[PDB]
Amino acid sequence: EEFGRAFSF
Amino acid sequence: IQRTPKIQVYSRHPAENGKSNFLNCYVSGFHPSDIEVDLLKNGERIEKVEHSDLSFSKDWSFYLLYYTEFTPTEKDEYACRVNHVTLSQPKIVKWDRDM
Amino acid sequence: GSHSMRYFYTAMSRPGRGEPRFITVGYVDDTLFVRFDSDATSPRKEPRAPWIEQEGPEYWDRETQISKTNTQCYRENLRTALRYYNQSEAGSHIIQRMYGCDVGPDGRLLRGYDQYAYDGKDYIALNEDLSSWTAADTAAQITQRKWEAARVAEQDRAYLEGLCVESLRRYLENGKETLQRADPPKTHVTHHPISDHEVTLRCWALGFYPAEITLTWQRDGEDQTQDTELVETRPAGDRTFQKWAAVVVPSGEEQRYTCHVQHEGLPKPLTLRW
């Protein structure tokens, strides 16, 4: 299962 | 800033004339990801060749497997033809059943 | 033994040819189990191994939503990278990410990863402590400052110590027929005369899983590192892998050479000769 939080560059 | 593909052409199982098998062209170590690969039988393109999903190695370089069913014979010649931004001309690697 | 789960993202801009393409693939060990492609006709997370097919509809909806959000997020990241490197909007560029976890035989976290590249070069990576970052250049230092301010490392750590290992443990159980089976190499030596004076000995390993393997040649018991041609391990297409190693030897001297094979499916390393 993937991590559902993305963080912008 | 770019990396040229390594190319191997080989069969899934040891080749035996008249027995069905899979012809594989494995391209790896390249960057960027755009690449064109044809499988050739007697110099002509084999239709409906399939390929794997784009993935990459620890050094970030990409790899792909192109493959098709084939029945090798004594006289039929097979090859892989690869184009990539790093190549001034397409590179042809002939299938050798011993490699 | 030990096991790994990894997700691999590739985001590729292509000015004049639409918006950047976003791809994800997921692996357990050397087994692909899921994929996503924004260029697909109806982009969704799709199963690629039989043991993931039993995950319910909520799993697939959540995984697809993550990937659809990522398509947009990574298009923004590509625009940001152009700014950070003073680059033109005319060129094509690539962001890559690999993240995931390794577990030991008891299922406990051995280590976690979250690392990124821009145009094929390292950009930023979570350190093994799961609490700090290594930035490759002053551009990535801008990202690092943002991620420190937002405590991104702590959020990654909570995932890597929790859901990452928990889901990998479940996949290993559901896929125990394949993910927990090593297939040992089938090995043999072939002999190819080159001339009157020399012959190629080629040591073959076929049909093995996982991909990790060691193949070496020795002459009189001494490793032949500089004199061995070793091809990259390559996929057969049936889940298994292939590799060979070759040496050029003087005619008549074949018996001085031995091939040595190490693989986790072999209870003891193998020695072969022509």
Numbering used by the authors:
A (entry chain P): 1 to 9
B (entry chain B): 1 to 99
C (entry chain A): 1 to 274
According to the publication:
Loading of MHC-I molecules with peptide by the catalytic chaperone tapasin in the peptide loading complex plays a critical role in antigen presentation and immune recognition. Tapasin, a key component of the PLC, is a 48 kDa transmembrane glycoprotein that bridges the TAP transporter and MHC-I to facilitate peptide loading. Mechanistic insight has been hampered by the lack of detailed structural information concerning tapasin–MHC-I. We present here crystal structures of human tapasin complexed with the MHC-I molecule HLA-B*44:05, and with each of two anti-tapasin antibodies. Movements of the membrane proximal Ig-like domains of tapasin, HLA-B*44:05, and β2-microglobulin accompany the transition to a peptide-receptive state. Together this ensemble of crystal structures provides insights into a distinct mechanism of tapasin-mediated peptide exchange.
HLA-B*44:02 and HLA-B*44:05 (B44:02 and B44:05 hereafter), represent tapasin-dependent and tapasin-independent MHC-I molecules, respectively, based on their cell surface expression in tapasin-deficient cell lines. The two allelomorphs differ at a single residue in the F pocket region, Asp116 in B44:02 and Tyr116 in B44:05. The X-ray structures we describe here address several molecular states of an MHC-I molecule (B44:05) and of its associated chaperone (tapasin) in the course of PLC stabilization and peptide acquisition in the ER.
